[PDB]
Amino acid sequence: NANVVVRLLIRRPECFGPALRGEGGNGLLAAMEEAIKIAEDPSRDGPS
């Protein structure tokens, strides 16, 4: 199951989120820092 899931995930790279896709993706650390900033800023976090 692990091998099958890894193979399907690498066939469809969009399952990794906006980051880790490449072609402009920032990265895990940058994405998590952006999430920290989103949590710190109320407006982009809640429906408002």
């Binding site: 690498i10 066939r11 790279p13 072609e23």
Partner: protein, 379 residues
């Protein structure tokens, strides 16, 4: 196929694209002799002696363009090698039939034969070679029957033109002119296009060895890359330093490594026959390089690199990566020169005139070992 960059590129990615396998030739169905597409050959005019070549022995880019008939050692040099390329991508390696259009490309220069109404035969560049001027056909008889071309078959076809035995007349597809000798009075006889020509205009075909074709293509590629390197060094010099100029440092390094591997001497533990064959191949490569003038190119590159007194100086004038690669490229160039001239009496006798210039730079640390090795081989 990747669209990330502007120019089309191919890479191994998890995205998939569609490929088509188009056949070219089948080895089994190809026959002994019996000229096929993509062949590298020589055009022989008279008693198997004159060959259609270009005056490339005395340098001169303008003199590369002219085409003539010459005899002697040109029949074994690389200046008389022509690749016959069909106009169809699919089955381009098929047998060549009478009247089938094709292009003749000079292997050493990479240029294509062509006919301009004002300056007869001429070699032009790939960009300007546009079928209408570069298409030629082989005809069995000078009589202009002009039946036409048949339906392009998808396969090896039928073998018609045979090496040596067959007599071929070269005809321009559009104008219909036949290739003829101008007979202007080492023959050095100009070749022209004439509407009727002479009766002894038969041209025979002599195939070239795979080693000869490989060496000629290597010569062309090395000449191109080393001329680019020399132009880059010249642009960096003359107090015209700028980052606009391109310096193919990694390309030159890899090409030098490949050339050293190409001219590496045969291994000792091999069998006697294999060692003799490899020695013969190495000697043929050295002779072809010498006839094309590669030693002079290496000497020019070494001289243009020696104007810099240190790797730090070369880095200051060109860039840091050039700084680290300067000493390595100099050592590789000296090793290439030593391999080129090693064991070749003719090559060393030709190099005899350059020993003074070579010895003039013994005191330099970066070149002492290479100059000493070259001098030892020559002496």
């Amino acid at each position: 196929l990747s669209y990330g960059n502007g120019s089309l590129h191919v890479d191994a990615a998890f995205q998939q694209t569609l490929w088509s396998v188009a056949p070219i030739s089948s080895g089994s169905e190809a026959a002994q002799g019996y000229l096929i597409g993509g062949d590298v050959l020589r055009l022989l005019h008279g008693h198997m002696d004159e060959c259609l070549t270009v005056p490339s022995g005395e340098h001169g880019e303008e003199q590369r363009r002219t085409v003539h008939y010459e005899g002697g050692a040109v029949s074994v040099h690389a200046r008389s090698l022509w690749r016959l390329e069909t106009l169809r991508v699919a089955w381009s390696g098929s047998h060549i039939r009478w009247g089938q259009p094709f292009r003749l490309r000079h292997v050493t220069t990479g240029k294509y034969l062509s006919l301009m109404e004002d300056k007869n035969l001429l070699l032009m560049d790939k960009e300007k070679a546009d079928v209408k001027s570069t298409a030629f056909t082989f005809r069995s008889s000078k009589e202009k029957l002009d039946v036409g071309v048949r339906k392009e078959v998808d396969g090896m076809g039928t073998s018609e033109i045979k090496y040596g035995d067959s007599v071929c007349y070269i005809q321009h597809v559009d104008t219909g002119l036949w290739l003829t000798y101008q007979s202007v009075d080492s023959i050095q006889r100009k070749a022209i296009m004439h509407h009727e020509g002479h009766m002894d205009d038969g041209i025979s075909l002599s195939r070239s060895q795979h080693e000869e074709s490989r060496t000629a293509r290597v010569i062309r590629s090395t000449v191109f890359l080393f001329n680019r390197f020399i132009r880059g060094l010249d642009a960096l010099s003359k107090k015209a330093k700028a980052s606009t100029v391109d310096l193919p440092i990694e390309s030159v390094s890899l090409s030098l490594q490949d050339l050293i591997g190409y001219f590496h001497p045969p291994d000792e533990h091999l069998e006697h026959e294999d060692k003799q064959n490899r020695l013969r191949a190495l000697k043929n490569r050295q002779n072809l390089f010498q006839e094309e003038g590669m030693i002079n190119l290496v000497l020019e590159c070494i001289d243009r690199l020696h104007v810099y007194s240190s790797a730090a100086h070369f880095a200051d004038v060109a860039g840091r990566e050039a700084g680290e690669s300067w000493k390595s490229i100099l050592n590789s160039l000296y090793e290439l020169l030593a391999a080129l001239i090693r064991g070749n009496r003719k090559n060393c006798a030709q190099f005899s005139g350059s020993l003074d210039w070579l010895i003039s730079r013994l005191e330099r640390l970066e070149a002492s070992s290479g100059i000493l090795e070259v001098l030892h081989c020559v002496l």
